Amino acid sequence: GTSQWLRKTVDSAAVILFSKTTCPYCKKVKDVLAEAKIKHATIELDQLSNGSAIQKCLASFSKIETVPQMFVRGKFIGDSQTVLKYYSNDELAGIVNESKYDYDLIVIGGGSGGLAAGKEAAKYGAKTAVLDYVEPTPIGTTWGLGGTCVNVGCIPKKLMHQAGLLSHALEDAEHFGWSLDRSKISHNWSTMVEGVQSHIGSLNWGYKVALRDNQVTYLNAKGRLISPHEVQITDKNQKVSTITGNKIILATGERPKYPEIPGAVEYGITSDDLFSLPYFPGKTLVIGASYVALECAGFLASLGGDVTVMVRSILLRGFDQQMAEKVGDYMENHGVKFAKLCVPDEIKQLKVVDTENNKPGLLLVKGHYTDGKKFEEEFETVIFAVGREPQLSKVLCETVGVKLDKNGRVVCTDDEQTTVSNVYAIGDINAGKPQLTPVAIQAGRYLARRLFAGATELTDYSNVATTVFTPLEYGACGLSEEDAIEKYGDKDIEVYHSNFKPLEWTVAHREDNVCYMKLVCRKSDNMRVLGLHVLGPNAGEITQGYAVAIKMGATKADFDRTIGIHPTCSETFTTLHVTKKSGVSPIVS
Amino acid sequence: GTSQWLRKTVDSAAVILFSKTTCPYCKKVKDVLAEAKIKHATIELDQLSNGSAIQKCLASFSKIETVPQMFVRGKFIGDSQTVLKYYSNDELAGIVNESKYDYDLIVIGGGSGGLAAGKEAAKYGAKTAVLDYVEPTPIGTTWGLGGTCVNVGCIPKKLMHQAGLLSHALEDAEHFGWSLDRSKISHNWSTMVEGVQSHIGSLNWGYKVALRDNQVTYLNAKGRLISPHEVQITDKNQKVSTITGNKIILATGERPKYPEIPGAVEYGITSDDLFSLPYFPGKTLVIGASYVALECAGFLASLGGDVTVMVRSILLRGFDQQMAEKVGDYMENHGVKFAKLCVPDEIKQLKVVDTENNKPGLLLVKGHYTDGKKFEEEFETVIFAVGREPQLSKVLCETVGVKLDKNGRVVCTDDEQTTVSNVYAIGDINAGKPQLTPVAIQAGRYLARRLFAGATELTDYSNVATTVFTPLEYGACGLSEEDAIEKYGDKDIEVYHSNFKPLEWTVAHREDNVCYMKLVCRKSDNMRVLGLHVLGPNAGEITQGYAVAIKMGATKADFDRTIGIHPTCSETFTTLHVTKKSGVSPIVSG
Ligand SMILES: Cc1cc2nc3c(=O)[nH]c(=O)nc-3n(C[C@H](O)[C@H](O)[C@H](O)COP(=O)(O)OP(=O)(O)OC[C@H]3O[C@@H](n4cnc5c(N)ncnc54)[C@H](O)[C@@H]3O)c2cc1C
Ligand SMILES: Cc1cc2nc3c(=O)[nH]c(=O)nc-3n(C[C@H](O)[C@H](O)[C@H](O)COP(=O)(O)OP(=O)(O)OC[C@H]3O[C@@H](n4cnc5c(N)ncnc54)[C@H](O)[C@@H]3O)c2cc1C
Ligand SMILES: COc1nc2ccccc2nc1CCC(=O)O
Ligand SMILES: COc1nc2ccccc2nc1CCC(=O)O
Ligand SMILES: [Cl-]
Ligand SMILES: [Cl-]
Ligand SMILES: [Cl-]
Ligand SMILES: [Cl-]
Ligand SMILES: [K+]
Ligand SMILES: [K+]
Ligand SMILES: [K+]
Ligand SMILES: [K+]
């Protein structure tokens, strides 16, 4: 069962060397290639279970079983003697560039997955193109290379979150003996946005150069797949040309949804517009209850905003709801208001945005609660966070035969492969996968290795940790309590929980018994940890490490036998004893 | 194999119930005991590999193989019919108190290990006493129940560390758009100490109540083992009485050493004195280079102190020295000066401490460098951090026949047992163990279970993670790079490293490529992680989780196959690719 792979590897590899670590002639070929700046895949037969078998099977393609053996785009070019010849003749350099296609890999979308998968392909000799185009938001907002995370996501939102937490640090400082008057300290939104944008601008250029450095051809162009190897590009001048590629990776991501109600698109904004917004939003309504909505509501309120969240049903749908409710209660006792069981019917305009004076406008939101009562209040700014969607109607002609699911997302096999043999899909557009930056990065790299370096390792999308950067952070890894109970049954679920108080909150006179953690375990499987959950400061930092134990199948005994680091929030995970079955209080003393 | 256990368990258990989960009369006995507020051990025979064998073996002690079966201090009390009889007659509270000894357990020392081991013993019906006495420092400083960590260690030092970090928070705030000038903001030492001591006072009281609530007899008394079951106590009035215990746990910990040079004891202080000090130390010398010395130097400097560290040899002896050097370089570019290769010869006094105005005095430190050159500078305050030592009775433990090693520490087996069968030792006095609070707690609890609840689980003292709360924190778990190379050979050691920059430092205009992490792995064992090391903010929070993966034998492949959380410092451990062998640079950029 080796030859299936060898055909797949040889034919799709751009430049590949079948080698050994202990082949003197394999060393000479490697050394030379590096001097000619010729990048390539290297598969070392002496470090594979099936080494013998592959040597004998190469005979099909090369007519010989020796090492080394260099291939270019499916074609055997030779052993060490033949490659050195072409080098001293200078015909080698032009041989490794001979391709049917302009490009070994075209990547449509220069975001988290695209950039990762392009840079990795180029490491193994792939003639690579990244296409990126940021279609503007309704009010005109646009941005540079990087994707959602870099420009309008993880990066700006966490920096603003940090702006938020420093507020409490100013509070905490007086109690820890510092002589500042927190009451006479205000926040300048423009100063903050200047700093955030400055950093994004440098990430934009950083990514431009990363591509240039690794000989990846960046085109600032809308790409459209008109057939399996043809990509139709459209540049800033509307100049429409075609470029050919062997392997196509779709990596186009998603954009914010707007509710289908009058005034939404005209008068309100999304996350896309928030992170470069030139004026303070002022009195703000966030419509939606996802991590984006509460993250944004949280930081706006911490920067002295008047913030209301309108929630259709529940907070953080898809997350453990005990933890979701605790996140919401924190925000509610710390200045964020909620309109529960409420939807928007209409956005009406009272004042237009004053670009002259950097003020926002003024809007009237009409809505209604589930019992039929009316909602009617003024807000300076209205942020929709009611979901994100792909639009491959833009990007793939429906006639190419890439099956999309009911929600517009690409249906892929376990190796990111679409219904077209040479076309792949990664990141937010890959149906069913968790919509996270690190997941788009590991998927994109691991795919590029499989295409261009004969790797077999697939991405593992299971037990992917997360962190919601609400004023009080919520980290998690694996199943919500409710999901564990549905899958294994209540009699098979043991839940260990405890409140805690960060030592930093003691002198600072913050709350006892609001920070909280639990382990959802499975009795019949040695109390296997199915779910880790924590609400407190630096939840991401706390949670991350445990993701490795959970991947490895950590049991409750594994948490117990580990010794804590003192003093930390994290340590309380090493001494949990109170079960939900016991009814004993998780408050601590 | 199993009757050996049953003898050991039944004999040493205070109150124990041989049970099953699906025994209706076992439920009735349990329910009743809980109503009578009678705490006890429960062993469920139907949840053990060896269940059948234990039922048949009870016949030696009880004359029967039924469940349930209740025992008190090695005496069979009865089956369910006999126990429900004794309950309705009210003879039952009587029967569970009968003891040869005043106490099932005396614990000498009410610190991290002692308090943990006493509270746990009482959970399983043990008649328990905790003795705690704080001998005052040379200047007279003293404190409440809780031990070194609570009053003089982890708690006050991290709170002062937090005071330190908020300095940077004030700086970072201006850049994130907040309208304060760091230059017009100073720190009040007394305000800070007031709040820290307030918190310690609440832990002092908290611990006193936790003991009372669990029916543990706290005695504020110097305890002394005069024989294997007899403990001689001496209260604040010098009233010298004796109390008997079945099992004795020594948990007396350590106190600061002073160098044998003139003026050290008279004119200078230690960590014990610092955390309640009524005046800002001002221009300060720390002698020593341990985690205490650099932790204390770091926070003093951050609170506008003029701080110098005198280092005999290297920073953080016993820790990975690449990481130790990087911790020191941070402190050096952030206001801490170092006198390298230097020892103190003399502390001379120029002014006495000004108790009138709560300012310090003034001292002259005379010392010398390893090349022979002189050292002479004025300091307002001089803190010794040159080691801690067991203050254990040095001849008494001999009279009793508890072997101490050459350094004053108790030589124990892997089950915390001393050379006297009924006497145990836990925490910093236990020779060879890591001197850490959570290690003292785990030791104490797991021992109390083994004595009073028939547990067999030992403590695992290996790969116990640490965190040095230097202004830039250093977390670690397992072997230093140099220790791994010495044990396995350099050919077999692969080291993955990378610099990083916290996103929080980007708008804040702090350093690129000073934060640093590495994984020391073993090539011949699937790149098994032998050591994780990290210098950045929240190092303890970062490090903790990985301690569990390493305990379970995490490989590099295990870190790679895990997906990162973005954006965090921790995630950079899920994508390390640069080896030290390759010579490629650790430096990064977005
Ligand atoms: C507000 C917000 C906060 C988030 N916070 C986090 C977080 O903290 N942590 C986390 O892990 N994830 C977070 N995410 C999710 C994360 O941003 C995404 O999972 C990730 O960016 C998606 O990667 P991608 O490459 O699939 O798509 P994207 O990063 O969206 O990249 C797609 C790119 O392709 C462009 N494009 C579209 N069509 C074409 C075309 N035809 N031709 C060329 N280019 C095209 C798009 O405009 C974009 O530049 C957040 C998302 C949002 C919206
Ligand atoms: C400055 C400093 C900072 C530290 N920071 C940390 C940290 O961040 N994290 C960490 O894990 N560890 C830290 N440690 C170490 C930690 O404090 C110790 O490991 C821990 O205190 C050991 O607990 P123990 O029970 O062994 O002894 P202790 O906690 O010291 O308890 C011993 C107690 O017994 C009393 N005693 C002694 N003899 C008698 C007697 N005959 N009768 C009655 N009472 C007696 C003593 O007065 C004392 O109260 C720090 C230590 C210091 C000095
Ligand atoms: C994820 O989007 C939703 N899925 C649902 C599934 C079942 C029931 C309701 C649901 N509501 C939403 C989005 C609206 C909301 O979150 O209230
Ligand atoms: C434990 O203290 C020491 N251990 C050593 C071990 C081996 C060699 C030298 C040593 N010097 C010290 C003394 C403190 C110091 O390191 O400066
Ligand atoms: Cl750009
Ligand atoms: Cl609860
Ligand atoms: Cl500084
Ligand atoms: Cl920070
Ligand atoms: K759009
Ligand atoms: K706590
Ligand atoms: K533990
Ligand atoms: K970084």
Side-chain angles (χ1 to χ4, degrees):
Chain A
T2 313
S3 59
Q4 299 99 73
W5 173 83
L6 188 56
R7 205 177 301 107
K8 159 150 44 158
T9 300
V10 161
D11 277 70
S12 62
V15 195
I16 191 162
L17 196 65
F18 293 94
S19 165
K20 285 180 181 170
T21 70
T22 91
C23 167
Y25 283 128
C26 302
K27 177 59 62 180
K28 279 156 103 226
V29 159
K30 284 170 145 146
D31 289 335
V32 153
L33 289 183
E35 151 173 286
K37 290 325 320 221
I38 297 175
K39 280 158 327 177
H40 62 101
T42 321
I43 271 166
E44 308 291 3
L45 295 172
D46 70 317
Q47 272 202 104
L48 282 169
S49 292
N50 39 336
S52 255
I54 299 168
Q55 274 189 240
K56 148 209 252 50
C57 225
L58 282 166
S60 272
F61 307 94
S62 58
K63 309 215 219 206
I64 63 182
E65 305 170 78
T66 64
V67 287
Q69 295 192 19
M70 191 179 171
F71 289 76
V72 164
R73 309 209 170 70
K75 227 162 58 101
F76 179 65
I77 71 161
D79 57 22
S80 65
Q81 170 239 357
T82 312
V83 162
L84 273 167
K85 202 205 152 231
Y86 289 141
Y87 185 46
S88 40
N89 285 238
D90 264 296
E91 189 170 353
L92 163 69
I95 269 227
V96 314
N97 280 303
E98 201 214 39
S99 178
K100 278 162 70 77
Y101 307 108
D102 304 322
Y103 295 106
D104 286 280
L105 172 69
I106 303 172
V107 174
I108 314 173
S112 277
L115 288 174
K119 280 132 137 229
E120 196 70 7
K123 279 161 85 286
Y124 307 104
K127 222 155 148 169
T128 310
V130 176
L131 315 173
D132 192 58
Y133 171 62
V134 186
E135 188 166 31
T137 74
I139 58 159
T141 320
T142 194
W143 55 81
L145 194 52
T148 292
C149 180
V150 166
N151 292 273
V152 291
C154 341
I155 302 313
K157 79 87 181 289
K158 204 185 180 183
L159 286 164
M160 296 214 175
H161 176 48
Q162 180 60 10
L165 297 167
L166 287 178
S167 181
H168 297 247
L170 297 192
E171 281 161 6
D172 291 357
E174 314 188 345
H175 293 305
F176 277 87
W178 289 101
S179 64
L180 77 157
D181 210 332
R182 169 54 177 95
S183 91
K184 293 96 192 188
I185 291 162
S186 60
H187 187 264
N188 181 319
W189 174 264
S190 274
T191 300
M192 190 198 58
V193 182
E194 204 286 333
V196 170
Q197 284 303 312
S198 194
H199 177 66
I200 290 166
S202 90
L203 298 180
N204 297 144
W205 270 95
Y207 279 116
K208 246 208 285 313
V209 161
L211 292 194
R212 213 168 46 107
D213 282 342
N214 292 50
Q215 302 70 53
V216 168
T217 310
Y218 168 44
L219 302 164
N220 183 202
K222 192 196 178 74
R224 166 129 115 129
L225 189 66
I226 50 156
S227 72
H229 299 292
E230 297 186 316
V231 169
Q232 194 195 45
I233 63 175
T234 310
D235 62 24
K236 61 131 53 70
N237 309 331
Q238 290 290 322
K239 179 180 274 291
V240 160
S241 51
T242 283
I243 55 160
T244 67
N246 187 25
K247 317 299 201 184
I248 307 294
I249 290 167
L250 307 177
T252 53
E254 293 191 327
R255 299 297 297 276
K257 294 166 154 211
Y258 287 87
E260 302 170 47
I261 65 170
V265 170
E266 296 86 334
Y267 304 142
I269 84 199
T270 73
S271 68
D272 284 347
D273 303 298
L274 183 57
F275 299 117
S276 49
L277 206 62
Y279 43 82
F280 188 56
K283 188 178 175 212
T284 303
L285 179 61
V286 177
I287 293 171
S290 56
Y291 74 84
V292 164
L294 304 180
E295 282 190 355
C296 290
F299 75 56
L300 287 175
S302 274
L303 309 171
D306 179 351
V307 182
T308 302
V309 182
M310 178 171 297
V311 185
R312 194 186 281 291
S313 55
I314 59 178
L315 311 184
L316 307 174
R317 167 169 305 275
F319 292 82
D320 180 292
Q321 284 292 287
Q322 183 198 8
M323 302 302 301
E325 177 175 39
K326 283 181 178 286
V327 161
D329 293 337
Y330 188 82
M331 294 169 65
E332 194 163 15
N333 324 303
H334 292 270
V336 175
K337 282 157 288 215
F338 297 81
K340 298 189 152 114
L341 305 175
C342 205
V343 303
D345 293 306
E346 210 186 353
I347 325 284
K348 277 188 258 213
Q349 182 168 244
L350 310 177
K351 294 181 179 192
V352 146
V353 179
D354 202 1
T355 59
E356 310 295 58
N357 290 254
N358 241 42
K359 316 143 33 184
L362 191 57
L363 304 175
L364 191 67
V365 181
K366 268 208 202 264
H368 76 267
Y369 296 97
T370 56
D371 63 14
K373 259 157 232 169
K374 288 315 155 218
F375 178 86
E376 191 161 305
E377 201 186 338
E378 38 165 79
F379 299 100
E380 288 179 291
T381 298
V382 177
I383 311 179
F384 303 100
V386 293
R388 298 168 52 80
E389 46 178 16
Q391 252 199 264
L392 287 173
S393 269
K394 321 229 133 159
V395 167
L396 67 88
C397 191
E398 310 299 21
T399 60
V400 168
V402 173
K403 192 230 181 92
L404 304 183
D405 73 3
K406 65 201 154 46
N407 305 318
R409 281 182 200 86
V410 171
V411 191
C412 300
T413 72
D414 60 14
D415 65 341
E416 287 77 71
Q417 136 127 109
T418 72
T419 60
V420 182
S421 80
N422 76 298
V423 182
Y424 294 86
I426 57 164
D428 294 1
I429 67 174
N430 186 326
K433 307 311 187 296
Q435 311 190 291
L436 301 173
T437 278
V439 168
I441 295 176
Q442 227 177 261
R445 297 195 172 128
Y446 282 25
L447 166 57
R449 280 168 203 190
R450 287 200 309 273
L451 288 167
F452 298 116
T456 75
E457 194 184 349
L458 307 178
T459 289
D460 183 351
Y461 300 93
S462 68
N463 295 316
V464 180
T466 59
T467 295
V468 177
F469 290 102
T470 35
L472 201 53
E473 302 177 359
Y474 171 32
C477 184
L479 294 188
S480 63
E481 173 156 349
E482 58 267 42
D483 284 359
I485 294 172
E486 191 53 37
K487 179 163 192 62
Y488 295 109
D490 188 64
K491 304 67 44 224
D492 213 21
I493 302 297
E494 195 78 291
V495 176
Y496 300 85
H497 68 159
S498 175
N499 290 103
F500 57 106
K501 182 164 200 167
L503 181 53
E504 294 70 41
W505 285 20
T506 58
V507 160
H509 294 289
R510 301 184 173 285
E511 298 89 335
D512 321 317
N513 311 309
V514 159
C515 299
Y516 183 74
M517 56 174 70
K518 59 171 194 196
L519 295 176
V520 175
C521 314
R522 186 189 170 188
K523 295 180 99 95
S524 75
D525 195 25
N526 294 318
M527 213 73 90
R528 193 79 57 187
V529 179
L530 299 173
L532 174 147
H533 303 270
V534 49
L535 177 68
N538 314 304
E541 304 298 355
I542 292 169
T543 298
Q544 180 70 270
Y546 296 109
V548 179
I550 286 163
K551 181 59 71 190
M552 290 171 73
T555 71
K556 179 50 167 82
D558 292 330
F559 282 67
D560 300 328
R561 75 195 180 117
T562 312
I563 308 313
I565 312 195
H566 180 53
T568 64
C569 296
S570 197
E571 76 182 301
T572 293
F573 268 115
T574 61
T575 63
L576 297 176
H577 60 105
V578 177
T579 65
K580 280 190 170 173
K581 277 321 161 187
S582 71
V584 178
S585 190
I587 65 173
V588 286
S589 56
Chain B
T2 304
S3 57
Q4 287 123 45
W5 174 83
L6 187 59
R7 210 175 298 107
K8 159 163 57 239
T9 299
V10 166
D11 271 52
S12 61
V15 197
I16 192 160
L17 197 64
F18 293 89
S19 173
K20 284 186 190 151
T21 65
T22 72
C23 161
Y25 282 105
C26 299
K27 178 58 63 199
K28 276 148 104 179
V29 164
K30 286 175 195 191
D31 287 339
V32 148
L33 289 180
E35 178 171 287
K37 289 325 319 225
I38 298 171
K39 281 156 327 179
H40 62 102
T42 317
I43 272 134
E44 310 289 358
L45 301 171
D46 70 320
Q47 281 194 124
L48 297 188
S49 284
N50 28 5
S52 258
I54 298 171
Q55 270 193 235
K56 279 182 262 84
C57 253
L58 283 165
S60 324
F61 309 96
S62 59
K63 309 163 118 279
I64 63 194
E65 284 152 74
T66 69
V67 284
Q69 303 196 11
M70 195 193 175
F71 294 75
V72 165
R73 309 207 171 70
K75 175 79 77 53
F76 179 64
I77 294 308
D79 52 34
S80 66
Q81 178 171 28
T82 304
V83 172
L84 299 168
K85 190 259 175 180
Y86 291 149
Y87 180 50
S88 39
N89 287 232
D90 271 300
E91 311 169 277
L92 190 56
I95 273 173
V96 317
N97 281 307
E98 201 163 344
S99 178
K100 280 168 71 75
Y101 304 106
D102 305 323
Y103 295 106
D104 287 280
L105 171 69
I106 306 168
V107 178
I108 314 175
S112 276
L115 288 173
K119 272 170 261 128
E120 197 65 12
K123 277 179 76 279
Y124 304 105
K127 223 130 75 104
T128 315
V130 176
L131 309 176
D132 194 59
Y133 166 76
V134 184
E135 193 182 329
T137 75
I139 53 162
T141 316
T142 199
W143 54 81
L145 189 57
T148 292
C149 178
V150 162
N151 311 268
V152 147
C154 342
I155 304 306
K157 82 86 182 290
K158 209 194 183 203
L159 284 163
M160 293 204 176
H161 175 51
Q162 181 60 10
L165 293 171
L166 284 172
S167 64
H168 288 262
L170 297 194
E171 282 164 341
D172 297 0
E174 314 175 14
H175 289 300
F176 278 94
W178 289 103
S179 66
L180 77 160
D181 199 356
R182 169 57 179 92
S183 77
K184 314 315 209 277
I185 300 156
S186 64
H187 184 265
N188 178 322
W189 173 263
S190 282
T191 302
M192 189 194 55
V193 179
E194 280 198 27
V196 171
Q197 280 300 312
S198 193
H199 185 59
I200 287 165
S202 91
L203 301 176
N204 296 143
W205 189 71
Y207 279 118
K208 181 182 226 169
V209 169
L211 292 199
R212 216 166 40 216
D213 286 352
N214 289 46
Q215 302 69 56
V216 168
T217 309
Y218 166 45
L219 303 164
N220 182 200
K222 188 155 159 285
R224 215 153 209 133
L225 190 64
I226 50 158
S227 71
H229 299 291
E230 293 190 312
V231 167
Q232 188 202 40
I233 63 177
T234 309
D235 63 25
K236 68 164 69 64
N237 308 326
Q238 294 305 327
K239 167 154 167 162
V240 163
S241 46
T242 287
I243 55 165
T244 67
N246 189 24
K247 314 302 184 182
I248 307 293
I249 293 168
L250 313 175
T252 56
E254 297 190 326
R255 299 296 297 276
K257 293 168 163 211
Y258 288 85
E260 267 264 288
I261 64 175
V265 176
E266 295 79 343
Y267 304 142
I269 82 199
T270 76
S271 65
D272 283 343
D273 299 301
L274 175 54
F275 299 119
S276 54
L277 210 71
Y279 57 78
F280 188 55
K283 186 180 178 201
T284 306
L285 182 59
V286 175
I287 285 159
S290 60
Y291 71 86
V292 168
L294 310 173
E295 281 187 356
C296 297
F299 75 57
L300 284 179
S302 284
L303 308 169
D306 178 357
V307 174
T308 304
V309 182
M310 172 164 312
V311 182
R312 141 148 12 214
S313 40
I314 62 180
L315 302 186
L316 305 173
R317 174 165 302 260
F319 294 86
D320 180 296
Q321 283 294 290
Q322 186 199 4
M323 302 303 308
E325 181 173 88
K326 286 178 178 292
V327 164
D329 292 333
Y330 187 88
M331 293 177 61
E332 202 165 350
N333 314 299
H334 289 270
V336 181
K337 284 147 295 129
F338 298 83
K340 298 220 124 108
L341 303 192
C342 207
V343 301
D345 294 303
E346 210 189 331
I347 326 285
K348 186 166 163 232
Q349 180 173 242
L350 306 182
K351 239 121 207 191
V352 142
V353 183
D354 199 6
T355 55
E356 319 295 71
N357 296 251
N358 276 328
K359 291 139 49 178
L362 194 59
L363 304 173
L364 196 63
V365 184
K366 294 190 197 261
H368 77 264
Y369 294 86
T370 56
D371 62 20
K373 276 191 210 137
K374 286 309 186 205
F375 178 91
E376 182 164 291
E377 206 185 336
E378 310 208 326
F379 295 102
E380 289 178 299
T381 296
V382 178
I383 314 166
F384 304 98
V386 291
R388 301 172 57 78
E389 45 185 22
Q391 269 192 359
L392 251 190
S393 300
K394 187 178 185 300
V395 210
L396 198 41
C397 279
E398 203 42 311
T399 298
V400 172
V402 179
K403 193 164 95 91
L404 305 182
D405 72 4
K406 70 144 152 36
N407 303 316
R409 283 186 200 90
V410 173
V411 191
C412 299
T413 71
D414 81 323
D415 77 298
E416 287 80 67
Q417 182 189 55
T418 73
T419 61
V420 182
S421 80
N422 75 297
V423 182
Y424 295 87
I426 58 162
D428 299 0
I429 60 169
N430 187 326
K433 308 311 185 296
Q435 311 195 293
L436 298 171
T437 276
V439 159
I441 295 168
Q442 184 100 329
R445 290 190 174 144
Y446 276 36
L447 165 56
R449 279 172 216 179
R450 281 199 314 276
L451 292 165
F452 299 117
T456 72
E457 189 152 343
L458 302 178
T459 290
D460 183 348
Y461 298 96
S462 68
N463 302 309
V464 182
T466 59
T467 298
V468 181
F469 290 102
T470 32
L472 199 60
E473 301 178 359
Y474 167 39
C477 184
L479 284 179
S480 65
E481 178 160 347
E482 62 265 40
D483 284 1
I485 293 174
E486 170 171 31
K487 187 180 179 49
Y488 294 114
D490 187 70
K491 291 69 43 224
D492 212 22
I493 303 296
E494 199 65 289
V495 179
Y496 300 86
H497 68 162
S498 174
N499 289 107
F500 64 102
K501 187 170 194 183
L503 185 47
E504 291 73 24
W505 283 20
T506 59
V507 163
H509 291 279
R510 295 190 173 290
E511 298 93 319
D512 319 290
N513 309 307
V514 158
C515 302
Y516 183 75
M517 57 174 69
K518 59 173 194 193
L519 294 182
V520 178
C521 317
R522 183 174 177 200
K523 292 162 101 123
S524 54
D525 195 28
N526 291 39
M527 219 66 57
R528 194 79 54 193
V529 179
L530 302 171
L532 172 148
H533 300 269
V534 54
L535 175 69
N538 307 309
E541 308 295 357
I542 296 171
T543 296
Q544 174 68 273
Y546 297 101
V548 181
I550 285 164
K551 177 60 65 204
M552 291 162 65
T555 70
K556 179 53 157 69
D558 290 319
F559 283 67
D560 300 333
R561 75 195 176 98
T562 312
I563 298 333
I565 311 190
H566 181 54
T568 63
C569 300
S570 198
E571 72 184 301
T572 290
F573 269 117
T574 61
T575 60
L576 293 178
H577 59 105
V578 177
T579 68
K580 282 193 158 163
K581 267 351 149 164
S582 71
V584 176
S585 193
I587 59 170
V588 292
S589 70

